[PDB]
Design a protein around this ligand. Structure first.
Ligand code: POV
Ligand code: ZK1
Ligand code: ZK1
Ligand code: C14
Lengths: 196, 403, 52, 104
């Protein structure tokens, strides 16, 4: 056996039902609706000074224009064409932005690398790791003359909270409650008994 | 009878110094250096802190030394294993070792973090020149399509501009050209708009995926050239008096700037200077000793960093009074310690191994967040502006038609 | 001072130093040490390096 | 007078164009010749720059403790100053007496 890592088991992390709309915040998703109503009413207003752009027809055109599809009708006056052009530019930017940020989400999530060895845990500093208070594992690290091992010991010697655990039952509990923050360093056989 | 100083990384008191104080208790870089000198030169030294708490300087009228020079010229102490900026007046009164560490006047700036995304940021993925070329390409294609359709179909200027704008924004075109020369223009503009929109989307995805942070200032020459960021020293000291007695082109500018500038850039103490750099987001740059800067950027909260090389080089020695038989027993020890790779090992350990933060871990720190309204609102403003303008021109046309 | 196909990146790893050496136990030891220290204080060694 | 010992070919000491036209120390000038002009005015001596012959900095040969080149020209009393880039080393220090670094 040997000294072995122990980390919280990664959960399945089921995605939300409406997770497709994460790449844009909730404020954006509602100001889109409110700007759509505003545009559909202004286009009616401008067309109706005194054709086909009633209010229902105008809401249909503006919906079509947001979804990049576009309808059979199109404004045929200068002051309706201005509204059309500006709403077109806005929807182009918003849709391009949604796709770009979704690609960013997927790309970043794909390059995820869990802490797999001791070297990776040594370089990384986001997760605190703690041995038992008094035992052969702590004395190992104190007497350790390996740079990576000494790097951990230098870290474990001083920490704002006590990374050390008094009891191995406490050590298991600390990792479970820390939700990935605590990484116990116990013997391999006990580790394989606990995870099983 | 070795002296020392209270500087935190160099000679420090352990936790509960009251419980344990003295030779076997004191810690610090100079402490371990003294121990290694003993290992190379066995001697009976008792560690005594400097009484005055500061380094040497001779009052003009008094003409007496004090601190680590007063404790050595007057036989009050044996040597001084501590940071002495070796210099002319101190060397005329003490015998100095070969410099066991070299340094300079570093530049200290706050670590650059991502700014608040300003409005009109949606047009960052493409350079300004490309946006201008897009505008004038649209206005050139529309007029050419008009001319073509009016050599040999309606496609007047007002309707051709609408067709081109519709084709760019990927929204379906109302009408399509029927001639051949009217169709070549349509095909070319379709290809162009497809490539441009694909480029914008792809580059924006690159912007959001991996982020690069650039230091606003790189070196002291560019810092003098910029002058948008205010840079200040300590009030009075070597790092301050250097700029007055400097005749290099850049340094005279960097002095005559801070010589006459409001408010007071000069800081009372280094703690206040680092606090001011941390407070002001990017407007303050601090010019301190290189070692102090390197040490500070390692401590919590690790919110600062050192940029640029050292402006002028100095050295720290191990002072020893002129007549001492220990005078030549320290030069050789220092040179051997330097050559063995032991002094560098010491500095490395006590500055990076005792590091509150590490650069080699979490350097990427990759995290992606939902795109807030702040990023986008620059297009909501344009949308509402366009609507207001449309209503305005509608009333203008109405009032014109009515008369 | 050579065609810029190469560049220096990163800080130097170790430390060294050049000194205007004098023969052991000679009469030009102290004045030369003073001359070098005073030159470095006034930047006459930084004006020269920036030149060549 | 005093005799100086400089190494060559570097950025430090170079031979001027029309070296044959010029004579004495002026026949070759460089950074460490300009330096070894300033030190004169603070130690007040008139020298004549003399390039080392062997063209090596110096090390005691393993077989025979003979110091070569620029430090050798000092140890054996052949010439006095060493106004040239001699790295400050322990082995050279135990034999010869340096100054404080003029460059790091
Ligand atoms: C009601 C009517 C318009 C809305 C008025 C907005 C006032 C409230 C926002 C205040 C604000 O934050 O100012 C900001 C926006 O300020 C602007 O000027 C917005 C530009 C939209 C005006 C119409 C766009 C073109 C019309 C349709 C065209 C067809 C500051 O903007 P700035 O002064 O330009 O400085 C650049 C900011 N930067 C540093 C991040 C780049
Ligand atoms: O011999 C000197 N050695 C010095 C060593 C240090 C440091 F190394 F940092 F400990 C400092 N500090 C600079 C800022 O950080 C805290 C104190 C000042 C020194 N001064 C005073 P100066 O003349 O103003 O440089 C000397 O005189
Ligand atoms: O005292 C010394 N002075 C030296 C001066 C120089 C330089 F001035 F830069 F020429 C150099 N070079 C840098 C590397 O490329 C070749 C020349 C080395 C030196 N060495 C080490 P070595 O001569 O390589 O054994 C010394 O020990
Ligand atoms: C469909 C036409 C839309 C026109 C949008 C014009 C954008 C103007 C933004 C200028 C900001 C310049 C900041 C330096």
């Amino acid at each position: 056996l040997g000294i072995s890592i122990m980390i919280k088991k990664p959960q399945k992390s089921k995605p939300g039902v409406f997770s497709f709309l994460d790449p844009l915040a909730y404020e954006i998703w509602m100001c889109i609706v409110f700007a759509y109503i505003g545009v559909s009413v202004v286009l009616f207003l401008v067309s109706r000074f005194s054709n086909e752009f009633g209010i229902f027809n105008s809401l249909w055109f503006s919906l079509g224009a947001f979804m990049q599809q576009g309808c059979d009708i199109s404004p045929r006056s200068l002051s309706g064409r201005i509204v059309g052009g500006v709403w077109w530019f806005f929807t182009l930017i918003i849709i391009s932005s949604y796709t770009a940020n979704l690609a960013a989400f997927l790309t970043v999530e794909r390059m995820v690398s869990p802490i797999e060895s001791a070297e990776d845990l040594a370089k990384q500093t986001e997760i605190a790791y703690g041995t038992l208070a008094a035992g052969s594992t702590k004395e190992f690290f104190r007497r350790s003359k390996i740079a990576v091992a000494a790097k951990m010991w230098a870290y474990m010697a001083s920490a704002e909270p006590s990374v050390f655990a008094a009891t191995t039952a406490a050590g298991a509990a600390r990792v479970r409650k820390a939700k990935g923050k605590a990484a116990a360093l116990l013997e391999s056989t006990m580790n394989e008994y606990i995870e099983q | 009878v070795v002296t020392t100083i209270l500087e935190s990384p160099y000679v420090m008191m352990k936790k509960n110094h009251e419980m344990l104080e003295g030779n076997e208790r004191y810690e610090g870089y100079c402490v371990d250096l003294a121990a290694e000198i003993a290992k190379h030169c066995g001697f009976k030294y008792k560690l005594t802190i400097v009484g005055d708490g500061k380094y040497g300087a001779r009052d003009a009228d008094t003409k007496i030394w004090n601190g680590m020079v007063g404790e050595l010229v007057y036989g009050k102490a044996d040597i001084a294993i501590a940071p002495l900026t070796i210099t002319l007046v101190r060397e005329e009164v003490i015998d100095f070792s070969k410099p066991f560490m070299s340094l300079g006047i570093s530049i200290m700036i706050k670590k650059p973090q991502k700014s608040k995304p300003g409005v009109f940021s949606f047009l960052d993925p493409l350079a300004y020149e490309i946006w201008m070329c897009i505008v004038f390409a649209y206005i050139g294609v529309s007029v050419v399509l008009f001319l073509v359709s009016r050599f040999s179909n309606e496609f007047g200027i007002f309707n051709s501009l609408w067709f081109s704008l519709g084709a760019f924004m990927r929204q379906g075109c109302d009408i399509s050209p029927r001639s051949l020369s009217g169709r070549i223009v349509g095909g070319v503009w379709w290809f162009f708009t497809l490539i441009i929109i694909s480029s914008y989307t792809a580059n924006l995805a690159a912007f959001l995926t991996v982020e690069r942070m650039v230091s606003p200032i790189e070196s002291a020459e560019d810092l003098s050239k910029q002058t948008e960021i205010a840079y200040g020293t300590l009030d009075s000291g070597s790092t301050k008096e250097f700029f007055r007695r400097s005749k290099i082109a850049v340094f005279d500018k960097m002095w005559t700037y801070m010589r006459s500038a409001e408010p007071s850039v000069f800081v009372r103490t280094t703690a206040e200077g680092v606090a001011r750099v941390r407070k002001s987001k990017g407007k303050y740059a601090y010019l301190l000793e290189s070692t102090m800067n390197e040490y500070i950027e390692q401590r919590k909260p690790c919110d600062t960093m050192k940029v640029g090389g050292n402006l002028d080089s100095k050295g720290y020695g191990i002072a020893t009074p002129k007549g001492s038989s220990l005078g030549n027993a320290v030069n050789l020890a220092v040179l051997k310690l330097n050559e063995e790779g032991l002094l560098d090992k010491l500095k490395n350990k006590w500055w990076y191994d005792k590091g509150e933060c590490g650069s080699g871990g979490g350097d990427s720190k990759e995290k992606t967040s939902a795109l807030s309204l702040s990023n986008v609102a620059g297009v909501f403003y344009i949308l509402v502006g366009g609507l207001g303008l449309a209503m305005l021109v509608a009333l203008i046309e109405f009032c014109y038609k009515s008369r | 001072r050579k065609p810029c196909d190469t560049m220096k990146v990163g800080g130097n790893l170790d430390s060294k130093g050049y000194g205007a050496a004098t023969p052991k136990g000679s009469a030009l030891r102290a004045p030369v040490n003073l001359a070098v220290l005073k030159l470095a204080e006034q930047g006459a060694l930084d004006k020269l390096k920036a030149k060549w | 007078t005093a005799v100086v010992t400089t190494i060559l070919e570097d950025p430090y000491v170079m031979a001027k164009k029309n070296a044959a036209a010029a004579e004495g120390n002026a026949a070759y000038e460089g950074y460490c010749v300009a330096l070894a002009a300033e030190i004169a005015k603070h130690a007040a001596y008139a020298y004549a720059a003399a390039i080392v012959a062997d063209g090596k900095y110096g090390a005691r040969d393993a077989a025979t403790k003979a110091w070569n080149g620029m430090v050798g020209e000092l140890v054996y009393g052949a010439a006095d100053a060493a106004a040239a880039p001699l790295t400050i080393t322990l082995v050279r220090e135990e034999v010869i007496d340096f100054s404080k670094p003029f460059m790091s």
